[PDB]
Amino acid sequence: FWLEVNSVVDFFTVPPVFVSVYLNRSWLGLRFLRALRLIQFSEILQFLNILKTSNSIKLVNLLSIFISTWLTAAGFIHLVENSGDPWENFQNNQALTYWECVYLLMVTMSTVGYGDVYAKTTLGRLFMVFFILGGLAMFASYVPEIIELIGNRKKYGGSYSAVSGRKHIVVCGHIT
């Protein structure tokens, strides 16, 4: 339980906020890790019976892993660019907003790369090399994202909502 991922998200979120109210001073630290809580959003739609097939549960699980990873990686770039390199006395920092980091990640991971925004610190360049090499060719380059996409198309129905006043009939055997 202690080294469970959702437990790690609490250890990097909760104590800093006690320090912040004790010192009466906010700190814009690793709080973005709260975005990693979106991964289990499939459980909410499944418990509320909004989400149907196991196939659609797999699709929403994959889609939420993409959004939460995108918002997390944008948080790491945000932190690492707004604070300089320490060997540079923190002087080479860059005033990227969080939304410029979200945009930079999208323009990079689509491989467009305009270079209107890019990481300038040495740490930011190390993180972008990691996010390019891990984001392509490991995190993307799945195969089940197409098998589940066509698996959503094969399914001929579930229940026949029988409407009142209409007569009804069932046909079976060799139907072709």
Ligand X SMILES: CCCCCCCC/C=C\CCCCCCCC(=O)O[C@@H](COC(=O)CCCCCCCCCCCCCCC)COP(=O)([O-])OCC[N+](C)(C)C
Nearest to 79 by CA among 64, 69, 93: 93
Q: Which is nearer to a second copy, 29 or 151 (CB)?
A: 151
Which residues 76-105 are close enough to bind ligand X by CB under 6 A? 79-80, 83, 86, 90, 97, 99-100, 102-103
For CA atoms 14, 26, 124, 65, the dihedral sign is positive
> What angle in degrees, to the nearest 10, is found between the helix axes of 54-82 and 98-109?
120
Residue 96, burial from CB neighbour count under 10 angstroms (0-12, 13-18, 19+): buried
Q: How far is the CB of 103 from K ion (least distance, A)?
A: 15
Residue 146 interacting with another protein (CB under 8 A): no
87 binds another protein (CB under 8 A): yes
Nearest distance from C-beta of residue 148 to another protein, angstroms:
23
- The token duo for 163 is 């409407």
Is position 106 an interface residue for a second copy (rule: CB under 8 A)? yes
Report if residue 44 touches a second copy, rule: CB under 8 A.
Answer: no
Binder to a second copy among 111, 161, 164, 176 (CB under 8 A)?
111
